[PDB]
A paper describes a structure:
Indanomycin is an antibiotic from the pyrroloketo­indane family which is known to act as an effective ionophoric agent against Gram-positive bacteria. IdmH is a homodimer, with the individual protomers consisting of an α+β barrel. Each protomer contains a deep hydrophobic pocket which is proposed to constitute the active site of the enzyme.
To improve crystallization, a number of variants were produced to reduce the surface entropy or to truncate predicted surface loops. One variant, containing a deletion of residues 99–107, resulted in large, easily reproducible crystals in the cubic space group F23 [Supplementary Fig. S5(b)] from new crystallization conditions. The asymmetric unit comprises one copy of the IdmH-Δ99–107 dimer with the entire polypeptide chain successfully modelled into density, except for the N- and C-terminal regions. Both the selenomethionine-labelled protein structure and the isomorphous native structure of IdmH-Δ99–107 were modelled independently, giving almost identical structures that superpose with an r.m.s.d. of 0.12 Å over 257 amino acids. The remainder of the structural description will focus on the unlabelled native protein as this should best represent the natural form of the enzyme. With this structure in hand, the crystal structure of wild-type IdmH was determined by molecular replacement using a single subunit of IdmH-Δ99–107 as a search model.
Numbering used by the authors:
A (entry chain B): 6 to 134
B (entry chain A): 7 to 134
The structure:
């Protein structure tokens, strides 16, 4: 049950802003598949990122939603593959939101080497307005 | 096995096989669809039942008649199955390829709870 621990560790490290642990748990050359909403001028939607590209998107999001946290609700593991359902919880200027995240991660030697994630942004925006 | 149920589900969606869909999904299943699937009568975040889900799926099928969903990775622990799928098609001459992530609870060979989200923004970027 090591890969499951890696992924649990990841979301805790994101919540705490723990860069050292994030960089331990994600390989520098990991293949990160972010959703189309995270696409920009340099990465069109569908283009994979590396670790530091992912951590860059995370930091941008955190600037807008400084109290946003992810809690793991369900986790399943088979071999080196871990899938998770999380709930992202925060407030936008005093109005609380609650958004589902679904993730799939490949772990090798206790490091994430591939990751897919999508968030239910439309539901979050419905809650805020 | 629960893995077999979920593999059967996506095959049944691809084939348009309503009979098998209704066998594999309990009528009272709790279906958590993304906010894009919300409307005037069912606000974003409100769970649906099977027939509500199959209603949204029929609209989606009618809109992208050549779309297929292929299970790429499947993980199982107990009664919980997660899948990564790729939805593929060609919409009016433009090919598209979009990730779907799903999580399903299976009991007695039927889906009783389901969460799904699809990377719609990437799909729309590929078409326009």
């Amino acid at each position: 049950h090591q890969p499951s621990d890696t992924i649990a560790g990841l979301y805790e490290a994101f919540n705490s802003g723990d860069l050292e642990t994030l960089r331990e748990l994600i390989a520098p050359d990991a293949v990160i598949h972010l959703p189309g909403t995270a696409g920009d001028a340099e990465h069109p939607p569908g283009t994979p990122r590396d670790r530091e590209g992912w951590l860059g998107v995370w930091q941008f999001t955190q600037a807008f939603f400084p109290d946003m946290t992810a809690t793991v609700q369900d986790i399943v593991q088979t071999g080196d593959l871990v899938a998770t359902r999380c709930v992202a919880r925060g407030t936008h200027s005093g109005r609380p939101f609650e958004m589902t995240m679904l993730n799939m991660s490949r772990v090798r030697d206790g490091r994430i080497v591939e990751h897919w994630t999508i968030s239910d942004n439309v539901t979050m925006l419905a809650q805020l307005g």
